[PDB]
C-alpha cells in the first residue's frame, strides 16, 4: 500500500499468466504492479548509497592572515630576507621603499623590503572520489494485503541491489516471493563525478570542474594542520608611495562556488556513506512465485462499517477502510461498484486484489483500493441486507 | 629639509624679486622651492581629512539562519501559516506537499506547507556620506635652515587649509613668514563619493554603485539590532519530491564586493574622521615676508670635518653633514664646488641657501645640499689651509 498518496505514482499491468514485468523505479516515484490472479504489489526505490569514498582534495574558500612581519635593507645592501620565507604557512613579497639619512641609511635610494604574513583557512570544501562498484540501492515492497493505514513482515519487504548482486528475491510470507533482476550499472554514471562537501551540504559535481577551481588547496591525505598550495589565490600585496607595503586577504569566495553549483545534484551524508535522493533503477520483476494468500477464504457474512469517509487519490482511485463486526475471519470481503443497485452488476475494478479480513477477533479493520468508472456509481461493501454503500462520482 | 630622500620630489624656482610661486602639492610628493635671496623651503601635503561623515546605509554580505520552523495543512484545509511570518527577522516561503491517510489527513492531495527561518547578519559593510565643506588639508613646511638630519619650531611649521579658510600664513621665526593661497574646492570632487567601510578597511566609492548593490541592507540610523530589507537577496528555499522544503543561505558575497572595489581609492580612519593618502592641492605661495635668517653672520674660521660620507640623492643633488670645531658661531659656512682647486672658481650651485653654523658651542653639526655640475668637481668646505674636500662625479 505504500504508493497510496504518492503523487508520482505509476500503474503497471502485467499480462495474465505472464512471468516478467518491466519497471522503472525512481527516487520520488512509486510503482503499483497488478496482474490477474496475483496480489497487487507496490515497489519503490527509497535510497541510493555510495560507500567507501576516498578524500581527493580540499579547497580553501575563506582565509585569514596574522603575525605580519617585515625585513628591510638600505640601498646597495642587497635584498631583504625574513626567515618566515622558509615557512610554508607564510606568504611573502618584496618591493622597494625610499631610504636615506632620515631613516637610518648611509646612502639615498631604493631599499629592499619584504613582508610576510601567516595564512590560515577559515572555511574549506572537500572533494571525495566515487567507485561505481560501491553503489547500493534499497527497494521497499508493500503488498496490497488488505492491511489498513497505520498498522503498528509479511506485507512488507526490503531488498538491496548492488552492481555485484543485481538479482534479489524478496519473500512475502503467505504471498510467496517476488524476483527482481535489475540493471544497477546502467543509469547515473559515477565515472566522472566527485562528491563535494561544503558547510555540511553536499553535491555531486564533475571532476573537470573540481580540478580547475582557482583556490588554495590541500591534499586529500593531508590531515591535521593543512599545507596549502596556491595560497596566492586568496592573498594580495599592496604598496603605497615607496613608503610601505601591506598584505590583504581576498574575501570569501563562498558565493561564487554556490553560484557554480546551481546546476548540480544534491546529496546527504549517512556517517561515512553518501546518500542520494535522485536517480533511478530499471528492473525486471519475476512473478512466477507470487501467490494470493487469501484466495481460499470463505466469504465474510457479518456487517461492515465505514470507519473513514472513502477518499479519492490524485489518480482517481478510491480508498476504503472498514470495520468488521464478525468472528468468522479470516474471510473474503464482498466489495464491488455498481451502477444498478438491483443488478449489482460489477463496474470498474479493484486495485487491491482479493480484499480480505484477516483476524478472527471482532471489530478488526481492513483497507482496499478501487478504480471507479467515470461518472456515477455505488461502492458496495458486504452482502445482503446489511451491506453498506457510498455513492461515488468520478470526474 | 623634509624633501631630502623623497623620490617624488619636485624643484620649483621662483623669479628673482618675485612675489608669488605656483605649486602643486600631492600626497606622496614633496616640493623644494628656491628663489634668489630667500631661504629654500620644502613644502608637502601630509594628510587630507574628511570630518563629520553621516552613516548612509549598511549592506549584509554574509548571513546565517537559525530556528527554522514549519506549519502544514491538509488538502482543502487552506493555506498554512506560522506566526513567525509576522516577525521581520524571519524569512518564509510556501509550497505544497503530498498528504493522505498515511500522514494524518482525511483527504488525499496537495497540502499547504510554510517554512520560516530567522535571518542574522554575520558581516556587513557601511557607507557614509561626505560634505565637501568638511575637508581639511595639512601642509608641512621645513626650511633648509642648515639643521642636520635627526635633530631632536623655527625650521618647521604646520599649516591647515580648509574650503572656508583657503589662505594661511606660516611663521618661520627668524626666516619671517610664508603665505599660502590654495584652491581646496578644486581637485578631488566629493560630490558623488561615499565612504565605504568593510572589515576595518576603507574606500571611496561612487554613490551610483553603492545604491545598486544587490544585498540586504539596513538604514543608516538603524542602531542596535538591525532590521534587514531585501533578506531574500541572500536566502533561498528548495523543495524535494512533494515531501519537504528547506531554507539555505547563499554564501558570503565578500569576494564579489572586493572584486568590484579594484578600481577605487583606498582610505583610513582616524577615530570618526576619514584620512585619505591620495589627492592634491594647488597653492600659490607668497614670498614677500620670507627672509634669510643668517645673511648677516660672519664667516666661520675654524676647521670643519665630514661626519658622514657625502651622499647622492635620487635627483643628483648631494647632502653634506659637517662638524665644526670652532666657537665663533653663529657663522656662515664657506661651501662651494670647484673644478680648479687653485682658482676656487664656483661651479654648480647650492640648494641650501646661506649654509650656517648656529650654535656657539664647539663640535656642533650642520647639513647642506648641493647641485653639482655634470662630470668631476670638488666639494670644498671651509677656508684656507684647513679646508676639507671631497671629489665628486655626477653622471
Amino acid at each position: 500500500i505504500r504508493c497510496i498518496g504518492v503523487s508520482n505514482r505509476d500503474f503497471v499491468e502485467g499480462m495474465s499468466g505472464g512471468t516478467w514485468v518491466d519497471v522503472v523505479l525512481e527516487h520520488g516515484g512509486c510503482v503499483t504492479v497488478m496482474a490477474q490472479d496475483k496480489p497487487t504489489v507496490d515497489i519503490e526505490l527509497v535510497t541510493t548509497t555510495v560507500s567507501n569514498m576516498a578524500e581527493v582534495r580540499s579547497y580553501c574558500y575563506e582565509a585569514s592572515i596574522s603575525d605580519m612581519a617585515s625585513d628591510s635593507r638600505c640601498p646597495t645592501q642587497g635584498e631583504a630576507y625574513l626567515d618566515k620565507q622558509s615557512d610554508t604557512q607564510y606568504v611573502c613579497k618584496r618591493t622597494l621603499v625610499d631610504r636615506g639619512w632620515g631613516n637610518g641609511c648611509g646612502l639615498f635610494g631604493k631599499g629592499s623590503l619584504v613582508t610576510c604574513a601567516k595564512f590560515a583557512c577559515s572555511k574549506k570544501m572537500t572533494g571525495k572520489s566515487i567507485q561505481p562498484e560501491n553503489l547500493e540501492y534499497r527497494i521497499m515492497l508493500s503488498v496490497h494485503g488488505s492491511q489498513h493505514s497505520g498498522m503498528i513482515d509479511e506485507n512488507r519487504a526490503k531488498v538491496e541491489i548492488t552492481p555485484n548482486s543485481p538479482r534479489a528475491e524478496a519473500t512475502l510470507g503467505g504471498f510467496g516471493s517476488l524476483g527482481l533482476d535489475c540493471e544497477p550499472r546502467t543509469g547515473l554514471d559515477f565515472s566522472d563525478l566527485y562528491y563535494l562537501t561544503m558547510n555540511n551540504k553536499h553535491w555531486l559535481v564533475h571532476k573537470e570542474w573540481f580540478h580547475d577551481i582557482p583556490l588554495p588547496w590541500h591534499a586529500g591525505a593531508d590531515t591535521g594542520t593543512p599545507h596549502w598550495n596556491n595560497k596566492e589565490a586568496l592573498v594580495e600585496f599592496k604598496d603605497a608611495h615607496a613608503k610601505r607595503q601591506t598584505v590583504v586577504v581576498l574575501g570569501s569566495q563562498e558565493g561564487a562556488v554556490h553560484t557554480a553549483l546551481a546546476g548540480a545534484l544534491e546529496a546527504e551524508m549517512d556517517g561515512a556513506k553518501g546518500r542520494l535522493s535522485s536517480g533511478h533503477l530499471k528492473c525486471r520483476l519475476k512473478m512466477d512465485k507470487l501467490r494470493l494468500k487469501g484466495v481460499s477464504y470463505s466469504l465474510c457474512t457479518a456487517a461492515f462499517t465505514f470507519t473513514k469517509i472513502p477518499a479519492e487519490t490524485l489518480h482517481g482511485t478510491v480508498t476504503v477502510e472498514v470495520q468488521y463486526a464478525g468472528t468468522d475471519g479470516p474471510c473474503k470481503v464482498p466489495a464491488q461498484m455498481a451502477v444498478d443497485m438491483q443488478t449489482l452488476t460489477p463496474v470498474g475494478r479493484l486495485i487491491t486484489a482479493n480484499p480480505v479480513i484477516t483476524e478472527s477477533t471482532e471489530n478488526s479493520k481492513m483497507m482496499l483500493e478501487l478504480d471507479p468508472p467515470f461518472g456515477d456509481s455505488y461502492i458496495v461493501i458486504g452482502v445482503g441486507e446489511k451491506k453498506i454503500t457510498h455513492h461515488w462520482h468520478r470526474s | 629639509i623634509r624633501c631630502i630622500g623623497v623620490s617624488n620630489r619636485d624643484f620649483v624656482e621662483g623669479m628673482s624679486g618675485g612675489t608669488w610661486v605656483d605649486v602643486v602639492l600631492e600626497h606622496g610628493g614633496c616640493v623644494t622651492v628656491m628663489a634668489q635671496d630667500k631661504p629654500t623651503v620644502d613644502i608637502e601635503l601630509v594628510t587630507t581629512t574628511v570630518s563629520n561623515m553621516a552613516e548612509v546605509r549598511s549592506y549584509c554580505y554574509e548571513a546565517s539562519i537559525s530556528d527554522m520552523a514549519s506549519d502544514s495543512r491538509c488538502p482543502t484545509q487552506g493555506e498554512a501559516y506560522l506566526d513567525k511570518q509576522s516577525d521581520t527577522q524571519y524569512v518564509c516561503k510556501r509550497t505544497l506537499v503530498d498528504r493522505g491517510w498515511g500522514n494524518g489527513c482525511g483527504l488525499f492531495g496537495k497540502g499547504s506547507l510554510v517554512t520560516c527561518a530567522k535571518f542574522a547578519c554575520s558581516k556587513k559593510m557601511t557607507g557614509k556620506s561626505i560634505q565637501p565643506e568638511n575637508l581639511e588639508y595639512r601642509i608641512m613646511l621645513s626650511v633648509h635652515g642648515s639643521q642636520h638630519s635627526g635633530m631632536i619650531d623655527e625650521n618647521r611649521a604646520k599649516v591647515e587649509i580648509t574650503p572656508n579658510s583657503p589662505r594661511a600664513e606660516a611663521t618661520l621665526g627668524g626666516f619671517g613668514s610664508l603665505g599660502l593661497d590654495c584652491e581646496p574646492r578644486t581637485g578631488l570632487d566629493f560630490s558623488d563619493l561615499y565612504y565605504l567601510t568593510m572589515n576595518n578597511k576603507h574606500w571611496l566609492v561612487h554613490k551610483e554603485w553603492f545604491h545598486d548593490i544587490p544585498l540586504p541592507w539596513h538604514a543608516g540610523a538603524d542602531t542596535g539590532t538591525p532590521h534587514w530589507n531585501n533578506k531574500e537577496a541572500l536566502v533561498e528555499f528548495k523543495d524535494a519530491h512533494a515531501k519537504r522544503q528547506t531554507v539555505v543561505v547563499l554564501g558570503s558575497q565578500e569576494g564579489a564586493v572586493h572584486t568590484a572595489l579594484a578600481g577605487a581609492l583606498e582610505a583610513e580612519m582616524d577615530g570618526a574622521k576619514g584620512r585619505l593618502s591620495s589627492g592634491h592641492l594647488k597653492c600659490r605661495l607668497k614670498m614677500d615676508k620670507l627672509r634669510l635668517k643668517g645673511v648677516s653672520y660672519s664667516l666661520c674660521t675654524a676647521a670643519f670635518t665630514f661626519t658622514k660620507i657625502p651622499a647622492e640623492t635620487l635627483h643628483g643633488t648631494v647632502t653634506v653633514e659637517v662638524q665644526y670645531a670652532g666657537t665663533d658661531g653663529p657663522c656662515k659656512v664657506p661651501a662651494q664646488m670647484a673644478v680648479d682647486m687653485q682658482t676656487l672658481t664656483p661651479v654648480g650651485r647650492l640648494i641650501t641657501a646661506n649654509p650656517v653654523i648656529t650654535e656657539s658651542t664647539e663640535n656642533s653639526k650642520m647639513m647642506l645640499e648641493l647641485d653639482p655640475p655634470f662630470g668631476d668637481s670638488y666639494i670644498v668646505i671651509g677656508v684656507g689651509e684647513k679646508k676639507i674636500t671631497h671629489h665628486w662625479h655626477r653622471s
Epitope: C74, G104, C105, R244 | -
Partner: antibody, heavy 128, light 109 residues
Framework: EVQLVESGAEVKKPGASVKVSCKAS????????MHWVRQAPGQRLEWMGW????????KYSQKFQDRVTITRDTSASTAYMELSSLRSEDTAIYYC?????????????????????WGQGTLVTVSS | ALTQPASVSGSPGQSITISCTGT?????????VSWFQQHPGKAPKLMLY???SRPSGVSSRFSGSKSGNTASLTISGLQAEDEADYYC??????????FGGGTKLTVLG
Amino acid sequence: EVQLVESGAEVKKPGASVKVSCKASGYTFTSYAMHWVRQAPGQRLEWMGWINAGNGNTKYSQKFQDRVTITRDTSASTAYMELSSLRSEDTAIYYCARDKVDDYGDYWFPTLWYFDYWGQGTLVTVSS
Amino acid sequence: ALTQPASVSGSPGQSITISCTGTSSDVGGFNYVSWFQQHPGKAPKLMLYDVTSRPSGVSSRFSGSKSGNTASLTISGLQAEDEADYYCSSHTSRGTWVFGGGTKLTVLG
C-alpha cells in the same frame, strides 16, 4: 617639561599577569610611540615592544608575542603593558620610553633619536 | 645580540673607548646606533644617537664612530661622574631593537 611616570612595584605569582601603566606629560601623547624595555636585576636591557599612541597599532618582540598586550588610553595620556603567564624569568624593572611617529601618523621607521625620554621604571617580582 | 666588553676603566683625565659589535642586520646595516648611560638606581639616559650625534646638553667629551659591524663610544677627559653602565643599541632590519650586554665604566680612584 617632558615626564613619563610609571606605576609602583608589584609582586605576582607565576602563571598570573601584570599590567603596568606609564603616564606621559609635557608632550602631545598621540604624536609618539611608547616602547617597553625591561631589565632583569644585574642584567642588560631587553626591548619588549611598542604601541603607536595615535592609531593604536602595536609591534611585539617574538619572544613576547603571545604573552604581551600593549594598549593606550588617549584621554588619560597613558600607555599600558600587560604580561601574562608569568614565569620566574620575568622578575625585572619595566621601563617605558618614547619615540616620535612621522607626520603621516605612521611608525614604520623610528626617528634617529629614539628613547630620548625614559620612565622611572617599575619593579615586578614573580614569586609564589 | 650586540657584544660589548664587560668592563672598561681609565684614570681621570684620560680617554677610553667602548666597542659594540653587531651584524649586517643591525649595527653594520643602519645608522640607528645609540649609546645610553645608566647610573645605579636610575633609568637609562640617551648619550649618543645616529652614530655620532649628541642630544643638546650632553658634553662633547662623548663621541661616537662606526666601522663595519662595530660601533664605538669614546669618552675623553674622564671624570668620576662618568662612572656608570653604558649600553649600545640598534634598530634592526626586522624593525626590532637590540641592546648590548652593557659595559661597566670605572674611573680609577
